[PDB]
Amino acid sequence: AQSVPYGVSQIKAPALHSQGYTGSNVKVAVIDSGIDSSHPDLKVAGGASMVPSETNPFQDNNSHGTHVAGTVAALNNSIGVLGVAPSASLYAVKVLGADGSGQYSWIINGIEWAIANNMDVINMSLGGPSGSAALKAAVDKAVASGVVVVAAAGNEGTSGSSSTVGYPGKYPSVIAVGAVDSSNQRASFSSVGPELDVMAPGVSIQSTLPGNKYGAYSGTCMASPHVAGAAALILSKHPNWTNTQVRSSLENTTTKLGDSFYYGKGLINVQAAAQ
């Protein structure tokens, strides 16, 4: 039997699914550790590896990219789990190695790849403490090209009165996503700052793992894909909307939680955002 992870329901995805809006024909790039294309609950359309030593993007030696991919797009069938946009065209852009780290060059190459291959949405469940002119130029070009760019805010928790949002989530062009639990409480590890945009479920999120497995992970890395998937649903309903429109709709229809420093605009609600 198929199980519907709490977080998919929490953001009100199933309402859209029942209406026939499932993300069909929207290309979502998962820029991460690759995706196990052999998982029965996923269908990978394409992608590319930017890691010099790991040339196959469809082999996930880490597990992280397969888990993020499941949240976006696990298939609607009689097994496994169910993604936010189960019909989305899923691309694996492998920029992290088996150890779950990668060089900035690799990540940026991956962003460039996604722009050149006309991805509609990019998900980056990754971040570092520092930016670069090249990282900023790449996300900016993506948005200027009409792509919706979403990223995890980071897992650095609080630090006095300072922002702890990582890059590239810190850039204005990117939607930075923090994590709540099933009670809508902010997860203690979720990064904070004025650059935080929205929240999505990020604690004990069940999804796909390599070798026909499922399991839970926690992090803003797990929250991000909910938003990327939500953007795909919106695009499936309103194919003519610009990235700006998609983003404003998500931000302006949230369930407001606490202060924006900790919660951004609040918890996304795809039902409301999809109008």
Size of the site for Ca ion (CB under 5 A): 6
Nearest to 227 by CA among 53, 30, 52, 75: 30
Task: By CB under 5 A, name the one of 7, 23, 47, 80 that touches Ca ion.
Answer: 80
Task: By CB under 5 A, name the one of 174, 187, 199, 221 that touches K ion.
Answer: 174
Out of Ca ion, K ion, none, what residue 80 binds, judged by CB under 5 to 8 A for its kind, is Ca ion
Give me the least distance between CB of 155 and K ion, in Å please.
16
**Which parts of 18-47 interact with Ca ion (CB under 5 A)?**
41
User: What residues pair up with 28 in beta bridges, in sequence order?
Assistant: 90, 121
CB 270 within 8 A of CB 85: no
Give whichever of 32 and 195 is closer to K ion, judged by the CB atom.
Answer: 195
User: What residues pair up with 93 in beta bridges, in sequence order?
Assistant: 31, 48
Out of K ion, Ca ion, none, what residue 195 binds, judged by CB under 5 to 8 A for its kind, is K ion
Give whichever of 74 and 165 is closer to K ion, judged by the CB atom.
Answer: 165
Out of Ca ion, K ion, none, what residue 174 binds, judged by CB under 5 to 8 A for its kind, is K ion
CB 246 within 8 A of CB 197: no
Give me the least distance between CB of 275 and K ion, in Å please.
23
Q: What does the binding site for Ca ion look like in residue numbers (CB under 5 A)? A: 2, 41, 74-75, 77, 80
